[PDB]
Design a protein around this ligand. Structure first.
Ligand SMILES: O=C1CC[C@H](N2C(=O)c3ccccc3C2=O)C(=O)N1
Ligand SMILES: N[C@@H](CC(=O)O)C(=O)O
Ligand SMILES: [Zn+2]
Length: 110
């Protein structure tokens, strides 16, 4: 389409470019996964094949992973440090992907 407005995802706090709607990834048949951590926090996680602009912190862990076969690392906004989600690795088809917290991103034109 011409002049799309639902094209890219930026960090909600600072505007860093993070991902693209084209890169949404339907893990287990859905790009959206509603999940909770051990602290009881609920996240609406959108899975993306690719992302940029993040800083991945520490070494991977399999503990409490929401995605069978994958280990996670915390993904912060590389610009402002906002916690945007997790990077997943060590699994199969795909080996890696990103799970980003939908309400911590702003969607907009390319
Ligand atoms: O797949 C994941 C990513 C990490 C996530 N997670 C959290 O968000 C968290 C907060 C506090 C203590 C421990 C955890 C943890 O494993 C979680 O529970 N599963
Ligand atoms: N979508 C932008 C690229 C960006 O802002 O990251 C452009 O077409 O110039
Ligand atoms: Zn940011």
């Amino acid at each position: 389409v011409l002049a799309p407005g639902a094209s890219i995802f930026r960090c909600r706090q600072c505007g860093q470019t993070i991902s693209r709607r084209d890169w949404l990834l339907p893990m287990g048949g859905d790009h959206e996964h509603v999940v909770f951590n051990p602290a009881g926090m609920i996240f609406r996680v959108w899975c993306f094949s690719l992302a940029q602009g993040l800083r991945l912190i520490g070494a991977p862990s399999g503990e409490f992973s929401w995605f069978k076969g994958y280990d996670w690392t915390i993904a912060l906004c590389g610009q402002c440090g906002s916690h945007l989600g997790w990077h997943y690795e060590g699994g199969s088809q795909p080996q890696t992907f990103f799970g980003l917290i939908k309400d911590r991103l702003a969607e907009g034109p390319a």
